[PDB]
Amino acid sequence: SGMKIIALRSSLKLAARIAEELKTEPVMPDERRFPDGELYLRYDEDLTGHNIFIIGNTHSDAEVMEMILTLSAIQDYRTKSVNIIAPYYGYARQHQRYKNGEPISSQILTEIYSSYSNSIATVDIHDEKTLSYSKVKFSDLHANDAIVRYYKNVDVDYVVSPDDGGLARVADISAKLGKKHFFIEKKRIDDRTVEMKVPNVDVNGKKLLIVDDIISTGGTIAKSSGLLREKGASKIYVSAVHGLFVNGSENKILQNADEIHVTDTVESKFSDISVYQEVCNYIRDID
Amino acid sequence: MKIIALRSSLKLAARIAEELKTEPVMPDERRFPDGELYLRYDEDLTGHNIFIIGNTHSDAEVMEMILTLSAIQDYRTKSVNIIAPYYGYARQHQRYKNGEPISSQILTEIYSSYSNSIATVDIHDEKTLSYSKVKFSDLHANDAIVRYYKNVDVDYVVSPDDGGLARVADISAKLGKKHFFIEKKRIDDRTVEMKVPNVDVNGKKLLIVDDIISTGGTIAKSSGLLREKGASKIYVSAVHGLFVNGSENKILQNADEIHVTDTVESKFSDISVYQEVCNYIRDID
Ligand SMILES: Nc1ncnc2c1ncn2[C@@H]1O[C@H](COP(=O)(O)OP(=O)(O)O)[C@@H](O)[C@H]1O
Numbered sequence: 348s349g350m351k352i353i354a355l356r357s358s359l360k361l362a363a364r365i366a367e368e369l370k371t372e373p374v375m376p377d378e379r380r381f382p383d384g385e386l387y388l389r390y391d392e393d394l395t396g397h398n399i400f401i402i403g404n405t406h407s408d409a410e411v412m413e414m415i416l417t418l419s420a421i422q423d424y425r426t427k428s429v430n431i432i433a434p435y436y437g438y439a440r441q442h443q444r445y446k447n448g449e450p451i452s453s454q455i456l457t458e459i460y461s462s463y464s465n466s467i468a469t470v471d472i473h474d475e476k477t478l479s480y481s482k483v484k485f486s487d488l489h490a491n492d493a494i495v496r497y498y499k500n501v502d503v504d505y506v507v508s509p510d511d512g513g514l515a516r517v518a519d520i521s522a523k524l525g526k527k528h529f530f531i532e533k534k535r536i537d538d539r540t541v542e543m544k545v546p547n548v549d550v551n552g553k554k555l556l557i558v559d560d561i562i563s564t565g566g567t568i569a570k571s572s573g574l575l576r577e578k579g580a581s582k583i584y585v586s587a588v589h590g591l592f593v594n595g596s597e598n599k600i601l602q603n604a605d606e607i608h609v610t611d612t613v614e615s616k617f618s619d620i621s622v623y624q625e626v627c628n629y630i631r632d633i634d
Numbered sequence: 635m636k637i638i639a640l641r642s643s644l645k646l647a648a649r650i651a652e653e654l655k656t657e658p659v660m661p662d663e664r665r666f667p668d669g670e671l672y673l674r675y676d677e678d679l680t681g682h683n684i685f686i687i688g689n690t691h692s693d694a695e696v697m698e699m700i701l702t703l704s705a706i707q708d709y710r711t712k713s714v715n716i717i718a719p720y721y722g723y724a725r726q727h728q729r730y731k732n733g734e735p736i737s738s739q740i741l742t743e744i745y746s747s748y749s750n751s752i753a754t755v756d757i758h759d760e761k762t763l764s765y766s767k768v769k770f771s772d773l774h775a776n777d778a779i780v781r782y783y784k785n786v787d788v789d790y791v792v793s794p795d796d797g798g799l800a801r802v803a804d805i806s807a808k809l810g811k812k813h814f815f816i817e818k819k820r821i822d823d824r825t826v827e828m829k830v831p832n833v834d835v836n837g838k839k840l841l842i843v844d845d846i847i848s849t850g851g852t853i854a855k856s857s858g859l860l861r862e863k864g865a866s867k868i869y870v871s872a873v874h875g876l877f878v879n880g881s882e883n884k885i886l887q888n889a890d891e892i893h894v895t896d897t898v899e900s901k902f903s904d905i906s907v908y909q910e911v912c913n914y915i916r917d918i919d
Pocket residue numbers: 438440441445510533534535538563666667668670
């Protein structure tokens with residue numbers, strides 16, 4: 348049952364929490380950039396005979412290179428298995444072609460990762476279609492219980508999804524909190540703009556928890572937050588699994604919301620909700 | 635045929651397209667707000683032999699190549715052929731220590747999974763060709779370097795290391811000149827040690843040729859030792875001129891002129907390899 352938890356640069360915080368829970372020490376590569384900007388890494392730890400769990404996100408160019416080179420480096424050891432855990436899975440928003448001649452980015456990248464591993468897992472992937480681009484079992488873990496635990500003793504009247512894709516998540520979270528829920532219809536206009544239709548639910552004087560998978564520009568949370576505030580909401584909590592927080596996102600959100608709490612899949616000052624338990628449960632099931 | 639020009643290779647790709655009597659294709663390209671890469675090919679690639687021209691050494695170059703390999707799947711093409719004038723990660727072609735990646739191996743496996751052929755110019759070590767599932771050709775800049783220097787007054791062609799000896803033996807012979815090589819030991823990313831053979835270069839004009847200039851450490855050290863030995867003039871050439879910060883200065887302190895190819899575009903790209911690449915393409919279609 349020997350396991351090694353590899354912590355890539357993007358995921359030191361979550362990887363450390365996972366390793367601690369599992370009573371093991373995180374393995375980090377010796378790593379640097381050559382002068383020409385190529386990536387170097389090395390695993391001095393003897394990975395022979397162990398189930399290997401590589402923890403790293405896959406959205407930035409550097410994250411991808413670190414994952415790919417890690418997948419080569421560990422071939423130097425006769426490992427028992429190689430299991431990719433990408434807490435935030437990059438390119439999950441480009442899961443099909445929207446115009447002729449576009450890449451299906453999550454397809455080619457998933458095919459690559461699955462060619463070099465025995466399993467892949469992520470937390471709350473943007474669209475499940477991508478899971479079906481993998482030749483190995485690609486598991487979609489869920490932050491639901493961690494979010495419930497954070498809000499167990501927080502006063503909330505409704506849990507709200509900003510889109511129809513998030514209906515199941517919020518039905519589950521509200522169920523577990525003994526609260527009501529509804530979802531908003533969303534249409535994305537461009538990288539930074541969305542349009543919404545909010546159902547005729549009376550939220551006057553009500554405390555709301557909005558939950559989504561990703562916060563990038565904050566356009567989605569900002570729009571839902573603003574429209575709900577217009578409707579008289581008294582307090583709005585915002586949570587998302589993956590907090591990227593680019594392009595003045597924090598300000599856009601807090602213009603109409605009160606607090607932001609995301610998980611540690613992407614490490615930021617808002618990472619108050621750890622998904623370590625969910626990832627450990629998965630690891631124990633494999634190891 | 636369709637010639638696709640990735641961002642790293644616009645100049646060489648244009649010269650290639652011109653020679654092959656076609657107009658180059660460039661993707662619409664942008665970064666999403668979260669830094670993810672977007673690209674799109676609007677030109678109908680259906681039924682054509684596709685030649686993707688782009689280097690493969692920086693993170694973005696690799697991502698542009700991988701995403702292009704997905705994007706062109708939207709068209710029913712006749713063939714897909716990668717031409718990476720400078721092939722990234724060719725210096726990590728084996729494991730020097732336990733637990734290192736064979737970077738050139740996994741990347742080559744990836745590229746050869748989505749193409750019918752790969753080519754590069756003067757790969758750093760030929761072992762990497764064997765990592766490919768498909769025909770992987772190694773093109774050569776030798777004749778283009780010879781053409782450039784054919785009427786230049788040179789006494790010796792010099793290789794800074796054992797690896798570049800075959801190249802300089804070929805270039806010198808073609809130029810009717812003598813040659814020798816220096817033995818080199820790399821100390822770290824920026825430092826090498828060399829032993830120059832007992833060759834009389836006092837008042838001699840020298841052409842140093844290597845495959846890659848990165849930091850310029852290798853050229854600087856060789857140039858300096860040869861200058862100490864009385865060399866009167868030193869030309870520096872390389873196939874792939876990366877010239878990372880400081881390299882230009884380090885080299886010009888001991889050398890008189892730098893001339894590299896257009897595999898990597900810079901102000902020193904005076905020697906083009908478009909002919910060699912076009913010759914290769916014509917064999918493919
Ligand atoms: N990382 C990204 N950031 C923003 N938009 C992206 C990203 N990747 C792909 N897209 C684009 O998002 C659009 C699809 O979004 P859509 O499914 O309409 O809304 P949602 O954002 O709810 O998934 C497509 O035009 C696609 O190219």
